[PDB]
Design a protein around this ligand. Structure first.
Ligand SMILES: Nc1ncnc2c1ncn2[C@@H]1O[C@H](COP(=O)(O)OP(=O)(O)OP(=O)(O)O)[C@@H](O)[C@H]1O
Ligand SMILES: Nc1ncnc2c1ncn2[C@@H]1O[C@H](COP(=O)(O)OP(=O)(O)OP(=O)(O)O)[C@@H](O)[C@H]1O
Ligand SMILES: Nc1ncnc2c1ncn2[C@@H]1O[C@H](COP(=O)(O)OP(=O)(O)OP(=O)(O)O)[C@@H](O)[C@H]1O
Ligand SMILES: Nc1ncnc2c1ncn2[C@@H]1O[C@H](COP(=O)(O)OP(=O)(O)OP(=O)(O)O)[C@@H](O)[C@H]1O
Ligand SMILES: Nc1ncnc2c1ncn2[C@@H]1O[C@H](COP(=O)(O)OP(=O)(O)O)[C@@H](O)[C@H]1O
Ligand SMILES: [Mg+2]
Ligand SMILES: [Mg+2]
Ligand SMILES: [Mg+2]
Ligand SMILES: [Mg+2]
Lengths: 24, 555, 265, 480
């Protein structure tokens, strides 16, 4: 049998930083 | 599909006559001058604007070899399979020159290889770049290959691929003249009544795209076939002596295999108007409010306020040409202010209903967000929807909480919201077709830059009704829920109603009706209608709600 | 410039600072003028700051990028400063380019302790882009605001925004030029326009008030047409703004800049 | 499955007759005029509202090739697998035309490609767009294909995908008539359903199915009796709560009760009687009185008699320190009350929530008031939402809050002075089982919530030492 190179997916799921706002 | 199947785009068909037809059908001219006229055209615009139908209409019109390619169809499983499918497309076009490649939804496979980081995705982009270079260098100088691509997101394309399209054609939302032509092409193989006026249909579909107008024709066709369905349900009911809709499904199910013929009908202009209301355009799926049921019959007196709103908003919406001749911009900004309960929201929900335009209502500080730039982005997105669905009415209820005056102590999260509205109302980008209404009790708390001509230049004062004004309001309130008319004048003109707003009169009627129920119960344990004695009961237990009218009259 | 009436002083400053060096940079290079300008237009609202910055963007025939206040702000940590850096990358690559910041006090607030840390990074990003290590030659920056004192003092220095041009309320003579400009670009003659613009009821009117005065005159024309049309159609026209219609507008329109000295400082 | 298995959607069942049945079964008429009637229908609404069952019931009632597809069933592992699964679904329908495609949970695969940066996910959206266009273009005139789809969050769909559905149907929360029909549709093959319908506000079609199963299951522990459903209803909760506090739980407060029997309780039990006389209910009632007088208890009694849900807010609990979060919490209370109609919204300590919008009130304290002003405009009338205020400082509330049509009517909850104390203590003791004369002298000793805490505190001494009169004097010296 021949072994083949296949393209697949990934999960990744990076986490991003955020900026907030405050009251007086 | 054919050229007739695409309508409302005359500039686009004019450009494409020398950018798609000439390279393909003018091969002899290019060879005489020894010039390789291989072109790349990128169609883009809102979804449903006839980008795919335009490509296939041109493909059948020109009559050259056509290679329609859908972007996801290229992707394969193994490593080199995906890139070889692209390589096969461009090699086939070179072998079939002159040819026209249509890459539909190219943004699916030609996304930015910077952000879309992978191994196959980067090689797919590099294969299209290599492919689009072979066509303009391997063709034998007499036959040209034109690449047509369509995408809803031209900004998602990789700049190396977007730059390879010499022509970008933007197919925006159709205008009134274009919408009429689209309807005629859609209603071309159908049978119509001579009463149908396409000008009326075009003017009653403000934010409709070519796909939305198709649904109107689709809904109108089913409207004309309703008479052959109700008559068919009557036939089913003749054999069988659970609700009404469930009976219809079961009766048709019980027959199913029965074969009947539908007599041919003609779509009536009345059916078209019904179809327009049923069809919700794709631009109004999100972000738009429902048209209020309030009408001018719900508003008593306020003739001075009604005249200003009719001239400033209702007028130009219904007669844009009349107001354009005198030189009035199709955009108004109105600030309604006064003591609470005097009919600001009521008179603003009647303008939105009696103008037949689109309506978006903002409930005070509804657009504010805790994240940086999200509060301002909502405001910018608000005017994008209101512009694509023009004419549109933006109602800012209790607006003083959304645009406070930029003092030296207003912080910066709320000061940036004001500056966003300053540019949206009157900046560089056009906002014609957007009519803004603001209602507030504290107009002095609104920034002065907001209250200037071009943003909210017209201020209308809605104050406490006068003695003769309360007579009109009380009759209006009473007639909408059903004493006579002579006693209503006596009750309204009573000095115990001094200082009563329009809300207090509604409270007076509610209090007078409660006394009726108490009277009925006493006259029951020993047809409820409010009597004059009931009114006098409520004339003592009801006090005005605006205790200090001077707090709102001076602003 | 045909849409802009009066403002001859402002027009001359903007031609020497932006339109001049763009069209013939060879002449301005010999005397030693860098191909980059920073202009801060400020004054009371409605007096023509955005209007005059749209004529410069159009008369200079250069590339144009317009920023609507705090349009570049993003919720993520680095994405708001990245937008500013990307803004000057496109402008530099397509020089000459005009960057217009409308209502700029919301993008460069004065840096204090009470200022948000996220909004202080955008100010410092613009400080380096306008005048830092890299060069911004061929980039001309125009800022328009009502509160020049709320802009960071480092932004308002030569090399970033060198010159401040005050666009204030028109004078009595200037209101005649503005009213004629607004009228002739939207279609009474000119003798009546001088009387309307010089009327004492037009005291304190800005450019937006004169445009509002003309709109109130057109609405008075339509009311007159409406009433007369019914009388001459049931019992028995041309919508044109007459001098009697201007009288109704003068008694209806009030000035909008109620405290001119609040912005004149 | 059958049509009878789905009920309460009479509007939906009649709209789909001209949109699903006609393009498929009545395709002979379309060929005569030469009109491709390829239609797309999207069904959206709250979870468990019969979206899945409605598609299957209509599938068998037409008699065409039905292709039931779920979105997770097409997602693959390799690159081209996921797109080819969707492509095969649309290619099969064209060959099987007329056909009825049903893409259940379509939001799983048809999400926005803006946020979704994944390559496969973007190509999934582009594959559905290409598939629906082939149906519109590559089918015979006499054979039309109708695409059905269901999603809990239609706004999550891509706008390009969503525009391809000409019809959107909002199968929202069932009403009293709808829930009555739903009960009659599940128990038909096995009783006053009006009482059952009104005693279960906020229940969905799936929740009403558990109640039917609970009653059937409880009927086999020993024909189903009516009393079994009442027990079964309380067993299954919807996926807020009707109070169990009756007016028997409330001592005295007769004048207060009379006003509420006409302002709130009145136009709920008999909506038509108050509709004929033109009594449009306002937003609600402001209860003002000293603390500890059972103002919260009174509101719970009103909801219990009216058989409406109860939501309570403690006041400053909503005050967030972020910009738009304090107002969003208020706007979220009225969003849940709309889905729980009829419901009663109770604002305890509302003086610190909506003060007067003075010339000096900062800005954060004024956005909350303007949030309630715009939210009380969709309260009462014909919505089922009722708002009850509660404050010991009624003059510290903004005037616009207390105008007619808003919380305008003020009711004073009186402090127990002489005989109210006696009535309260007897009521409290009736739920913890001495006579009644002993219970009088305890309450006659020289507020309202103190007695409730006194009774249970006095019960602690009994446990330390059956409740006797001599155990109350010791507790009177340690309860304040
Ligand atoms: N100008 C037009 N003339 C006639 N029909 C039109 C026009 N514009 C749109 N339509 C009709 O509306 C629908 C538009 O679908 P089409 O595939 O052409 O949209 P699109 O621009 O490719 O958008 P998408 O990117 O979402 O596929 C078709 O049914 C087409 O017949
Ligand atoms: N002029 C009027 N004609 C008829 N009904 C009126 C009038 N004014 C008030 N009402 C009645 O009283 C109600 C007052 O509510 P409305 O929203 O109109 O007040 P408002 O002016 O917006 O004040 P607020 O600032 O308190 O919202 C109306 O909904 C209507 O029932
Ligand atoms: N000098 C002028 N000549 C002609 N028309 C003018 C002039 N000044 C103002 N106008 C008219 O009034 C409008 C005022 O809008 P403009 O954008 O110029 O105000 P602004 O100075 O930018 O103030 P703001 O700070 O409120 O944005 C112009 O669009 C134009 O119609
Ligand atoms: N209106 C209704 N009439 C009759 N039965 C109903 C009704 N609504 C729901 N049901 C029943 O309750 C259950 C609801 O499950 P279903 O799968 O139909 O819900 P759904 O709307 O698709 O939501 P989800 O996908 O979140 O489950 C089924 O057993 C169905 O028979
Ligand atoms: N009139 C009354 N009848 C019966 N119980 C009462 C009465 N007044 C007060 N109570 C008791 O006092 C307690 C008060 O609780 P709650 O109403 O939540 O606080 P507040 O009275 O401060 O609003 C209740 O648990 C209730 O049992
Ligand atoms: Mg398309
Ligand atoms: Mg209002
Ligand atoms: Mg401006
Ligand atoms: Mg389901």
């Amino acid at each position: 049998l021949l072994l083949l190179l296949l393209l697949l997916l990934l999960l990744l799921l990076l986490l991003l930083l955020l900026l907030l706002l405050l009251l007086l | 599909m054919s050229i007739l199947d695409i309508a409302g785009v005359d500039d686009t068909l004019q450009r494409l006559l020398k950018e798609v037809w000439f390279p393909l059908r003018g091969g002899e001219a290019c060879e005489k001058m020894g010039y390789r006229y291989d072109n790349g055209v990128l169609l883009h615009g809102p979804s449903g604007c006839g980008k795919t139908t335009l490509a296939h209409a041109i493909a059948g019109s020109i009559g050259v070899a056509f290679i329609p390619v859908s972007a996801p169809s290229v992707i394969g499983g193994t490593s080199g399979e995906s890139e070889k499918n692209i390589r096969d497309v461009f090699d086939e076009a070179i072998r079939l020159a002159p040819c026209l490649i249509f890459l539909d939804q190219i943004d699916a496979i030609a996304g930015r290889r910077e952000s879309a980081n992978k191994g196959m995705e980067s090689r797919i982009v590099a294969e299209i770049m290599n492919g689009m270079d072979r066509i303009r260098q391997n063709t034998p100088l007499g036959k040209n290959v034109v690449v047509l691509a369509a995408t809803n997101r031209p900004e998602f394309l990789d700049p190396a691929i977007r730059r390879r399209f010499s022509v970008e054609i933007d197919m925006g939302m159709p205008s009134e003249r274009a919408r009429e032509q689209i309807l005629r092409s859609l209603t071309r193989d159908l049978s119509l009544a001579d009463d149908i006026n396409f000008k009326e249909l075009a003017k009653m579909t403000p934010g409709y795209v070519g796909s939305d107008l198709q649904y109107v024709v689709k809904a109108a066709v089913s409207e004309s076939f309703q008479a052959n369905i109700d008559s068919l349900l009557a036939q089913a009911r003749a054999k069988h002596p659970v609700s009404q809709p469930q009976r219809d499904w079961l009766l048709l199910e019980a027959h199913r295999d029965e074969e009947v013929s539908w007599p041919s009908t003609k779509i009536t202009m009345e059916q078209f108007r019904k179809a327009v209301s049923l069809v919700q355009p794709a631009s109004k799926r999100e972000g738009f409010s429902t048209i209020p049921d309030t009408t001018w019959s719900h508003v008593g007196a306020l003739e001075d306020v009604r005249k200003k709103l009719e001239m400033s908003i209702i007028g130009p919406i219904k007669n844009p040409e009349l107001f354009t001749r005198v030189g009035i911009k199709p955009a108004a900004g109105i600030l309604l202010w006064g003591p609470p309960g005097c009919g600001k929201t009521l008179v603003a929900k009647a303008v939105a209903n009696e103008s037949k335009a689109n309506f978006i209502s903002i409930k005070g500080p509804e657009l504010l967000n805790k994240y940086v730039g999200e509060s301002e982005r909502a405001v910018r997105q608000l005017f994008s929807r209101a512009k694509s669905s023009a004419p549109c009415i933006l109602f800012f209820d209790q607006m003083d909480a959304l645009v406070p005056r930029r003092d030296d102590s207003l912080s910066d999260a709320s000061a940036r919201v004001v500056n966003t509205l300053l540019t949206e109302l009157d900046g560089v980008g056009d906002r014609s077709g957007i009519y803004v209404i603001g209602a507030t009790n504290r107009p002095d708390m609104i920034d002065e830059a907001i209250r200037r001509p071009g943003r909210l230049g017209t201020s209308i004062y809605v104050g406490l009704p006068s003695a003769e004004d309360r007579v009109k309001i009380l009759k209006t309130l009473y007639r909408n829920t059903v004493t006579t008319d002579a006693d209503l004048e006596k009750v309204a003109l009573d000095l115990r109603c001094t200082g009563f707003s329009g809300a207090d009169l509604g409270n007076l009627m509610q209090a007078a009706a409660q006394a009726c129920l108490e009277r009925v119960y006493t006259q029951r344990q020993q047809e409820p209608v409010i009597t004059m004695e009931d009114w006098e009961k409520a004339l003592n237990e009801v006090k005005p709600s605006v205790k200090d009218p001077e707090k709102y009259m001076h602003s | 410039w045909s849409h802009v009436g009066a403002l001859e002083d402002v027009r001359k400053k903007l031609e020497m600072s932006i339109i001049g060096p763009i069209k013939n940079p060879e002449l301005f290079t010999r005397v030693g003028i860098k191909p980059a300008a920073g202009i801060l237009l400020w004054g009371p609202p409605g007096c023509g700051k955005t209007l005059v910055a749209k004529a410069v963007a159009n008369e200079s025939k250069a590339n144009f990028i317009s920023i609507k206040g705090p349009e570049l702000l993003n919720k993520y940590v680095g994405e708001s400063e990245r937008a500013v850096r990307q803004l000057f990358s496109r402008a530099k690559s397509s020089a000459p380019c005009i960057l217009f910041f409308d209502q700029m006090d919301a993008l460069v607030p004065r840096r204090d302790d009470s200022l948000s840390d996220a909004s202080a990074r955008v100010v410092n990003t613009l400080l380096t882009e306008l005048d830092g290590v890299g060069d911004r030659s061929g980039i001309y920056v125009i800022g328009a605001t009502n509160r020049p004192d709320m802009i960071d003092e480092a932004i308002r220095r030569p090399g970033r925004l060198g010159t401040s041009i005050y666009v204030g309320l028109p004078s009595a003579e200037d209101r005649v030029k503005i009213l004629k400009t607004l009228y002739r670009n939207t279609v009474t003659t000119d003798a009546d326009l001088e009387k309307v613009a010089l009327d004492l009821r037009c005291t304190g009117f800005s450019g937006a008030d004169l445009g509002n005065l003309m709109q109130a005159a057109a609405q008075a024309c339509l009311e007159r047409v409406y009433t007369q049309r019914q009388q001459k159609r049931k019992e028995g026209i041309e919508p044109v703004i007459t001098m009697e219609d201007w009288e109704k507008a003068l008694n209806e329109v009030k000035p909008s800049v109620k405290d001119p000295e609040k912005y004149m400082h």
